[PDB]
């Protein structure tokens, strides 16, 4: 409701000069990103669970492995992204931003990556947007590497054997269009 | 979504079913259905292992915190006699009392026993009861660096939300919850 959003939204802070142009680079050539009150919302949720490692699925440009590493400046993020143009582009911002030692950039098919990402250590968190599709798969793939205790968070779940997944307590909370936090048991 | 968002409720045991019916016929304050389910879902994320609440009341949300997080412990603190008892008797009802510690006093004159606790990692207060304020400058140093004051009925607050020592969010659920986490000479002048 247009009066709750306009109190909430006035207590996001400004970003980084650099960040803020990156919000503009993504509108400009269609890459979707969070918007500024959910991108929020989980950075808080993050802060909370207290993650030392987040894996992301899609990087895009960056942004939200980004806004992750400035918000947790102890964690570090694994994040993998497909096509090398968005693949390239993220890795300058990471590199401008001197956080190429806290985000893990990988390029490029996550579906032969979890060779790799099996000898990693297990994952406090594991981020994946049900939107970039393919949602099943890599929930099957990345699920195993996540903690006991640990978190998958789904950005765009609803847009059931998720929430009925014997291993996971699932929760959907309103931000952005609905994130699923399933915690594993 | 709002709408399915709105049902998302599984059944409580019958005897936690009955304490809710109670309190809404005997109008004892109580967190909405909704709130609790966000609220207890994000406690599992963040994993506590001791709480501290303020305001028991008929021991609902002491209950159903300790019911979901089966390790943690909690020490809650009510002012009225008649809601302390009948706390102690759910809690008693529910086996519960291991877990569970009532404190039956005024915050407010109880810092100095509370002090001698060790930090908990979650303080649990709540934005329509009375105090709220005093409350929270009294009881947000045993709160751990890291650690969480939730606070209900945030929305149905400018203070805390630009308080120092906290990074403090609103969540619109239930009747809004705060989470505010807890951030990290003389002739001497002679010689020096
Ligand atoms: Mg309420
Ligand atoms: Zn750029
Ligand atoms: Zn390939
Ligand atoms: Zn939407
Ligand atoms: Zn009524
Ligand atoms: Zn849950
Ligand atoms: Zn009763
Ligand atoms: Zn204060
Ligand atoms: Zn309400």
Same mark, same amino acid.
């Given at each position: ?26 509108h ?13 919302? /989980?950075?808080?949720?993050?802060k ?9 699925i ?13 918000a ?28 190429e ?11 032969? /990556?979890?060779?790799?990402?099996e ?24 699920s ?23 291993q ?18």
């Amino acid at each position: 409701e247009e009066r709750l959003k306009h109190y909430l939204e006035k207590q996001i802070p400004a970003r980084d000069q650099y960040i803020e142009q990156m919000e503009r680079e993504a509108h400009e050539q269609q890459v979707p990103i969070m918007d500024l009150l959910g991108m929020e919302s /989980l950075l808080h949720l993050l802060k909370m669970a207290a993650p030392a490692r987040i894996l992301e699925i899609g990087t895009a440009i960056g942004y939200s492995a980004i806004r992750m590493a400035q918000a947790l400046p102890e964690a570090t993020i694994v994040s993998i992204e497909r096509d090398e143009r968005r693949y390239e582009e993220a890795h300058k911002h990471v590199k401008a931003l001197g956080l190429e030692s806290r985000i893990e950039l990988l390029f490029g098919d996550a579906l032969q /990556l979890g060779e790799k990402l099996e000898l990693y250590p297990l994952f406090d968190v594991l981020f994946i947007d049900a939107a970039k599709g393919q949602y099943r798969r890599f929930f099957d793939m990345y699920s195993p590497m996540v903690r006991p205790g640990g978190l998958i968070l789904s950005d765009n779940v609803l847009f059931q054997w998720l929430l009925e997944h014997p291993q996971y307590d699932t929760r959907i909370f309103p931000v952005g269009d609905g994130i699923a936090i399933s915690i594993k048991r």
